[PDB]
Amino acid sequence: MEQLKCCSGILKEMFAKKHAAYAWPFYKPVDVEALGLHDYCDIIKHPMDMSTIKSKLEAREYRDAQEFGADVRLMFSNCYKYNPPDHEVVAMARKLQDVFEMRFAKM
Numbered sequence: 680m681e682q683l684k685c686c687s688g689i690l691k692e693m694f695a696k697k698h699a700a701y702a703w704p705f706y707k708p709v710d711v712e713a714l715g716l717h718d719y720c721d722i723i724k725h726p727m728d729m730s731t732i733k734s735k736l737e738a739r740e741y742r743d744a745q746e747f748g749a750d751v752r753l754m755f756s757n758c759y760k761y762n763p764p765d766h767e768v769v770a771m772a773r774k775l776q777d778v779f780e781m782r783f784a785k786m
């Protein structure tokens with residue numbers, strides 16, 4: 680679909696240098712072992728990150744833009760669920776979500 684090409688463009692924007700200061704904690708799966716977040720899998724049933732989303736899009740795992748969008752929002756929701764609301768990573772997720780929501784609304 681044309682909307683799946685729009686999804687590739689959303690990912691290029693989210694990975695761009697302009698947003699790297701707040702997007703970088705979302706680039707790859709949360710490394711629970713390196714970060715000592717041994718309670719993460721008890722709270723987060725479905726972990727999600729930008730590289731996994733990119734691989735799924737490349738592998739045609741999304742039928743349309745809504746399925747793609749649901750994984751991007753799952754990534755943010757995981758961050759909002761796991762961390763206290765005042766956490767630095769939550770502010771970063773909000774900034775990255777602003778980039779996504781603005782671009783997603785254009786299609």
Ligand SMILES: CCS(=O)(=O)Nc1ccc(Oc2ccccc2)c(-c2[nH]c(C)c3c(=O)[nH]ncc23)c1
Nearest residue numbers: 703704705706707708709710757758761762767768
């Ligand atoms: C590329 C993924 S990484 O795992 O390789 N690098 C990495 C490194 C540090 C990190 O922590 C922070 C904490 C404060 C500010 C910035 C990042 C995180 C991280 N990322 C998410 C989504 C987190 C979360 O929700 N809670 N705590 C930590 C989370 C991921």
